[PDB]
Amino acid sequence: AWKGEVLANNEAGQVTSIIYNPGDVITIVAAGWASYGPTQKWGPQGDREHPDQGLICHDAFCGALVMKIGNSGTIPVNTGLFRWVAPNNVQGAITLIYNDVPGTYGNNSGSFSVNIGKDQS
Amino acid sequence: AWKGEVLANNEAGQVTSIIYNPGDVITIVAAGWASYGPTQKWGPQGDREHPDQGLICHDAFCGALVMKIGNSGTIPVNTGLFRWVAPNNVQGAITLIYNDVPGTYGNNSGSFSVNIGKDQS
Ligand SMILES: OC[C@H]1O[C@@H](Sc2ccc3ccccc3c2)[C@H](O)[C@@H](O)[C@H]1O
Ligand SMILES: OC[C@H]1O[C@@H](Sc2ccc3ccccc3c2)[C@H](O)[C@@H](O)[C@H]1O
Ligand SMILES: [Ca+2]
Ligand SMILES: [Ca+2]
User: What CATH number does residue B16 fall under?
Assistant: First the structure.
């Protein structure tokens, strides 16, 4: 199991200890308050009211938690994922990333606290 | 496991299948949008800006997901709980509830999708 913080201002992402492999079932729970700039903060679902202007993930609100698995595109994580299996051919190290516009990360603040573990399979 | 919706306007809370027994290890994941009345919606964490005007759970924000296990007082769930063990002597059916002020539930809208699973122990 892995546990740590994912900083909203961490553009490159927060590498984890978790290597997702074919057939794996995983659960993720994410918690906390972050911002992409505005003083207000949002949870790991991000800001539902916020237009998308080149977000690193277009399948999640600006300011949501997303991930990458190995070489995959971005994948929404949001509040977490319960007993979850990746699409085909998706595998490798999980990297957790705060969803904002490339280059805009520097005014960001707050972080999420995230747990990830493998489930029975 | 149990999966289901917890309606924001359900002041009595949503009874689940899960009976928490001493020594259980459980995981909950909560997703989605709900409102305690206002036009905006908030996730399972609630509204960090709204003051507590007599909420059924004083340890979570207005609009957060909380629960009752058997005869316990309300316990914060928020976005969820990772491989979590109840406090000494806490046991019984898990009821999921939207955190609002008693009797002010009628103007609530939306819901949370919640998964609960028992973990290996
Ligand atoms: O798209 C994210 C960007 O949003 C702006 S705020 C901001 C607020 C309200 C807005 C309303 C409409 C359009 C853009 C808006 C941008 C952040 O400060 C910036 O760092 C970047 O992350
Ligand atoms: O605190 C829970 C209550 O919040 C109000 S919103 C609202 C907005 C601004 C306010 C300003 C002052 C005092 C209460 C206020 C309540 C809801 O409409 C009501 O149904 C109940 O859930
Ligand atoms: Ca930003
Ligand atoms: Ca209300």
Answer: 2.60.120.430
As for ligand 1, residues whose beta carbon falls within 6 Å of it are A 36-38, 51, 53, 62, 100-101, 104, 107
Å resolution of this model?
2.2
HSE, side-chain direction, 13 A CA sphere, residue B82: 20
Which protein residues have a CB closer than 5 Å to ligand 4 (ion)? B 36-37, 100, 104, 107-108
**Mind spelling out the 3-state secondary structure of chain A?**
CEEEEEECCCCCCEEEEEEECCCCCEEEEEEEEEECCCCCCECCECCCCCCCCCCCCCCCCCCEEEEEECCCCEEECCCEEEEECCCCCCCEEEEEEECCCCCCHHHCEEEEEEEEEECCC
Residue of B41, B100, B108, B109 with the most ligand 2 atoms within 8 Å of its CB, for mutation:
B100
Eight-class DSSP state of B102: T
- How was this structure determined? It was done by X-ray
Domain count of the fold of chain B? 1
SS (H, E, C) B5-37: EEECCCCCCEEEEEEECCCCEEEEEEECCEECC
Which domain range does residue B8 map to? 1-121
